[PDB]
């Protein structure tokens, strides 16, 4: 017999030493080597409930991230309260890499393996192991990138689909990829290149699923409203530059229902001078390095909010929103959850 | 004790604008979002939006299409409200309004204790 | 979404008043009262969870799909009118106005 507890976890990783990439340092110092045989038990008739909206696993990686982010990706200047400083600013080799979460002795993780689970409530398929897979701390906002896909169907995920507050998470079980390129020889700007035939047939299946959740009403997509750049834009981190791209084009209500079938690029410009998600200031950071800088990623989550009001209508509006970038950590986490043992 | 302190009333003529101001203090500024909330003199409380000072996204109401805009000032503490064509039906009085709560990172609530004293905007030829 | 009922309540300094709302959802529940002219003032929440400085005269219940605020022996600042709150809706509301 056991119970839902919270305790200091710890990472393990296939980190390499020889490596200069500042995943790769940051891993060496803070984390330890996988299992090569690792365990998983089923558990035969066993219920068990998960919150994936209360997990203080999704609150532990963050903090990790924090300080990864705090001893690597340092700023030329540093604007915080007011205050300014200045520290240096070299480029670094970036690329998220997998990270395991892991239970110290006398606990465990229990794992929900219940297919289009949505994350909260009961789990009729539970395992235990002693480490979570891979995640990477990928940081974007509204697409979620490189992540786990749905096993089965998309799932909608949410705290409260009546509650507007809350963020909806969109799980998707195909990967779309997307594919961000700044040209070698204005140095700043660049843009992002989606398959508009393959995209436009997940958002038209997003539209049915979120349909089975809001009685079958008019689905309507728009633009953030407002705020700061890395919420009206798609912000992410490639090869150590900060991309922003605008993504009206993505959620084009047009499509939903010719003419689109093509390519569909999204312009996109690199910021030397950003708002940091940790929250306090800004930081600048050198101008992008030179040549032709490429990323290939996944879309394979959403995140949406939806808008309130006291009207009698029969739509609903969603707006690619998000919130805490801990939600993203949620999106992969949800089948987790920390139990310590009687 | 949190403390909200909207800015002074005001008259205005059919199509004008105007920036309602509201100055926060007591409490961690970036811990809790601030809503809004117009009152039409005899009619039902009707909610505005949100608006979150970590990022600065915003949830308008779609009863309310395209006459407002939110923004924040999260060094000087400060949220903003800005009535766009305004006409006889936006004579009302405009509050700014905290959660109670949280010991969350982010604060969302819906339960509102704490309310501004409100800005009566007049609008008529 | 909200039904509020009754628009307005006729009662004398001691008697009681019963401020009933109705929900279409099943979410949680609140009480604001909101003396002339002054901004709203939380009353009750979470269906019948009582708020700070807010006496035990008040007393919020839930039965079904609907709340209902009772308030006993009327006592002046509680005249006013007072709204039913459900998420981003508000119940069209009820003045408590003194009658003699």
């Known amino acids: 017999v056991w119970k839902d507890a919270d305790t200091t976890l710890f990472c393990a990783s296939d980190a390499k030493a020889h490596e200069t990439e500042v995943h790769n340092v940051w891993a060496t110092h803070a984390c330890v080597p996988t299992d090569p045989n690792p365990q998983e038990i089923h558990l035969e008739n066993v219920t068990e409930n998960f919150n994936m909206w209360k997990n203080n696993m999704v609150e532990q990686m963050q903090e990790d991230v924090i300080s990864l982010w705090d001893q690597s990706l340092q700023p030329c200047v540093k604007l915080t309260g007011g205050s300014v400083i200045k520290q240096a600013c070299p480029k670094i080799s970036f690329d998220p890499i997998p990270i395991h979460y892991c239970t110290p002795a006398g606990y465990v993780i229990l794992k929900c393996n219940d297919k289009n689970f949505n994350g909260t409530g009961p789990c009729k398929n539970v395992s235990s192991v002693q480490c979570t897979h891979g995640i990477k701390p990928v940081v974007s906002t509204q697409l979620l990138l490189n992540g786990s896909l749905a096993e089965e169907e998309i799932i909608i995920r949410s705290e409260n689909l009546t509650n507007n507050a809350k963020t909806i998470i969109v799980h998707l079980n195909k990967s779309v990829e997307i594919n961000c390129t700044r040209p070698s020889n204005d140095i700043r700007k660049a843009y992002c290149e989606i398959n508009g035939t393959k995209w436009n047939k997940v958002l038209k299946q997003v539209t049915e699923k979120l349909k089975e959740h809001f009685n079958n009403k008019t689905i309507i997509f728009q633009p953030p409203s407002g705020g700061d750049l890395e919420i009206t834009m798609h912000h992410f981190n490639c090869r150590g530059e900060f991309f922003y791209c605008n993504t009206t084009q993505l959620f084009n209500n047009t499509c939903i229902g010719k003419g689109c079938n093509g390519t569909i690029t999204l312009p996109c410009k690199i910021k030397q001078i950003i708002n940091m998600w940790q929250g306090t200031g800004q930081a600048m950071y050198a101008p992008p390095i030179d040549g032709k800088i490429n990323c290939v990623s996944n879309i394979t989550g959403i995140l949406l909010t939806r808008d309130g009001g006291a009207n009698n209508t029969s739509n609903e509006t969603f707006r690619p929103g998000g919130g805490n970038i801990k939600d993203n950590w949620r999106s992969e986490l949800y089948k987790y959850k920390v139990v310590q043992i009687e | 004790e949190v403390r909200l302190r909207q800015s002074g009333a005001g008259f205005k003529k059919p199509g004008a604008s105007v920036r309602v101001s509201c100055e926060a203090s007591?409490?961690?500024?970036?811990?809790?979002?601030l809503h809004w909330i117009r009152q039409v003199p005899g009619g039902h409380p009707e909610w505005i939006g949100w608006?979150?000072?970590?990022?600065?996204?915003?949830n308008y109401s779609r009863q309310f299409p395209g006459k407002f805009t939110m923004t924040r000032d999260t060094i000087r503490e400060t949220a903003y409200l800005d009535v766009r064509g305004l006409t006889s039906d936006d004579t009302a009085v405009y509050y700014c309004?905290?959660?109670?709560?949280?010991?969350?990172?982010?604060?969302?609530?819906?339960?509102?204790?704490?309310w501004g004293q409100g800005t009566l905007v007049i609008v008529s030829p | 979404v909200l039904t509020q009922s009754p628009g307005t309540l006729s009662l004398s300094p001691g008697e009681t008043a019963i401020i009933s709302c109705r929900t279409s959802q099943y979410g949680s529940l609140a009480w604001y009262q909101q003396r002339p002219g002054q901004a709203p003032r939380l009353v009750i929440y979470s269906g019948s969870t009582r708020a700070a400085g807010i006496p035990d005269r008040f007393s919020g219940s839930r039965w079904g799909p609907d709340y209902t605020l009772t308030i006993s022996n009327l006592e002046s600042g509680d005249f006013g009118v007072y709204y039913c709150?459900?998420?981003?809706?508000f119940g069209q509301g009820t003045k408590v106005q003194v009658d003699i």
């Open positions: 709150q459900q998420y981003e809706f």
């Open positions: 309004v905290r959660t109670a709560d949280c010991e969350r990172d982010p604060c969302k609530g819906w339960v509102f204790p704490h």
């Open positions: 608006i979150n000072p970590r990022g600065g996204q915003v």
């Open positions: 007591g409490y961690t500024f970036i811990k809790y979002y």
